[PDB]
């Protein structure tokens, strides 16, 4: 049925090109973007996603926001009949050798970092990563009197007020709150600029003086004041078995190791919870949803130590669910878990990476649905091919279309990385249009999301705080929902 098929519709969003608003807070090429956006509209795309870069907007100084170029961008998106996913991007864009779009965090913050190097995530060797402020300074009032969370709160409130017309009109479907490197709720455990290459295990990023002191206090309260941060976890490009920490029977399974990993992962849960508290306050009553981005760390998923997840801050083992606690935390904020790797197949990864993107996706999505939250996601890598789109479509509706009503399982949306000239080339775009159609359960584009039961209602207050022990009850392993082996709505026949 046309209506029952419409209840199966999963909306599709497309990420805008990086730097559409440049580092100087100039919307550089509105005419070129317009032509691209109109192609997306005709293709049936529901909306677009953009980074709203902190380093662009609050560059002049504290609380000196310039929203004008982004207003022009939003105005154009509105004219082209698309909705918008706005990322509160509190992180650096680019900065690696070769990168074209380079947007550091505000220089006034970096200036404070020159005086206080511990505002940055730091590895054991002491390298400071300037892409994001450590969770350690979330509540440290060291930024001309403000804490880091107060910076993020103030920025979101200013966005809400200055974009109030677009918000009231329904242009903005969700606010994705950036929570770390690349906007993701994680530690910067695999930096290219410090030499990491896939599939290195990465490194723990808790050596800044704030986190180190917090850990030392915690171990003292646990009756082990002498415990130190890991010293046997190796380096970025190691394999797990080469390390004391991650080898079989290694430090990760000792009382000390388990305590550290709980501590380290808990910092991210509380980071996200506290910053989402501010987002709910900032956007209270607006017809938007809140979202976060969870990183997809699929390498080493297939070995018992899950080492790359662990250094990223996801304490996920075969007998400990490190993602369902995140979902549970999101529930009190009514927030969407936006994931990734939706296009990937295990067979596409090198054997030596012990990579399990399919199973990781199944775990994370299942945990969200088990916790009765919305789950969305992205492709991890650029892909233009049918294999990729069919995998996305499978993940979007893992038990297929329900011919007789809404599907029991569906993702809330998918955001495609990324708009480019390549996407819009004739063949690539033709297959993309088939992807959109199948995401839409063979229905034409539906401008009114109420028709597919995605009405936008005013954002409510956060529900009461959930104690950490209750969050961690969600570490109890659960069986995933069953997945089909292939979608029933392939782009071809």
UniProtKB/Swiss-Prot annotation:
Q: How does it assemble?
A: Monomer.
**What is the name of this protein?**
Beta-amylase
Q: Which Pfam families match?
A: Glyco_hydro_14 (PF01373)
Residues that coordinate or bind substrate: 51, 91, 99, 293, 298, 340, 379-380, 418
Reactions it catalyzes: Hydrolysis of (1->4)-alpha-D-glucosidic linkages in polysaccharides so as to remove successive maltose units from the non-reducing ends of the chains
What species is given as this protein's source? Glycine max
Tell me which EC number(s) this protein carries: 3.2.1.2
State the Gene Ontology terms under molecular function: beta-amylase activity
Similarity-based family: Belongs to the glycosyl hydrolase 14 family.
List, in alphabetical order, the GO biological process terms annotated in this UniProt record.
polysaccharide catabolic process
UniProt keyword terms in alphabetical order: Acetylation, Carbohydrate metabolism, Glycosidase, Hydrolase, Polysaccharide degradation
Provide the active-site residues from the annotation.
184 (proton donor), 378 (proton acceptor)
Is this entry keyworded Lipid biosynthesis? no
Record's keyword annotation contains Signal: no
């Amino acid at each position: 049925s046309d209506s029952n098929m419409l209840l199966n519709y999963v909306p599709v969003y497309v990420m805008l090109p990086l730097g559409v608003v440049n580092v100087d807070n100039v919307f550089e090429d509105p005419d070129g973007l317009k032509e691209q956006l109109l192609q997306l509209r005709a293709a049936g795309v529901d909306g677009v996603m953009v980074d709203v870069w902190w380093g662009i907007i609050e560059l002049k100084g504290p609380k000196q926001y310039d929203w004008r170029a982004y207003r022009s961008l939003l105005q154009l998106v509105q004219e082209c009949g698309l909705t918008l996913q706005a990322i509160m991007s509190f992180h650096q864009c680019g900065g690696n050798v070769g990168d074209i779009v380079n947007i550091p965090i505000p220089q006034w913050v970096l200036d404070i970092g020159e005086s206080n190097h511990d505002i940055f995530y730091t590895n054991r060797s002491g390298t400071r990563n300037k892409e994001y402020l450590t969770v350690g300074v979330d509540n440290e009032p060291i930024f001309h009197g403000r804490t880091a969370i107060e910076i993020y709160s103030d920025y979101m409130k200013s966005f809400r007020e200055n974009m109030s017309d677009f918000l009231e009109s329904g242009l903005i479907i969700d606010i994705e709150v950036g929570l770390g490197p690349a906007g993701e709720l994680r530690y910067p455990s695999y930096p290219q600029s410090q030499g990491w290459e896939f599939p290195g295990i990465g490194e723990f990023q808790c050596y800044d003086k704030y986190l180190k002191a917090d850990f030392k206090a915690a171990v003292a309260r646990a009756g082990h004041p002498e415990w130190e941060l890991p010293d046997d976890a190796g380096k970025y490009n190691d394999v797990p078995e080469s390390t004391g920490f991650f080898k079989s029977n290694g430090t990760y399974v000792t009382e000390k190791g388990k305590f550290f990993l709980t501590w380290y992962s808990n910092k991210l849960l509380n980071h996200g919870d506290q910053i989402l508290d501010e987002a709910n306050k900032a956007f209270l009553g607006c017809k938007v949803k809140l979202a976060i981005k969870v990183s997809g760390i699929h390498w080493w998923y297939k070995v018992e130590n899950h080492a790359a997840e662990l250094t990223a801050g996801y304490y996920n083992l075969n007998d400990r669910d490190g993602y369902r606690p995140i979902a549970r935390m999101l529930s009190r904020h009514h927030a969407i878990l936006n994931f990734t790797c939706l296009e990937m197949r295990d067979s596409e990864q090198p054997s030596d990476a012990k990579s399990g993107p399919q199973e990781l996706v199944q775990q994370v999505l299942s945990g969200g649905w088990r916790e009765d939250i919305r789950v969305a996601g992205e492709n991890a890598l650029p892909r233009y091919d049918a294999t990729a789109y069919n995998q996305i479509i499978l993940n979007a509706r893992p038990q297929g279309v329900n011919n007789n009503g809404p599907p029991k399982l569906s993702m809330f949306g998918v955001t495609y990385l990324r708009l480019s000239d390549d996407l819009l080339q004739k063949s690539n775009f033709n297959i993309f249009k088939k992807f959109v159609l199948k995401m839409h359960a063979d229905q034409d584009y539906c401008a009114n999301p109420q028709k597919y039961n995605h009405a936008i209602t005013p954002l409510k207050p956060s529900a009461p705080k959930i104690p950490i022990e209750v969050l961690l009850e969600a570490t109890k392993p659960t069986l995933p929902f069953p997945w089909l082996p292939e979608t029933d709505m392939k782009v071809d026949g």
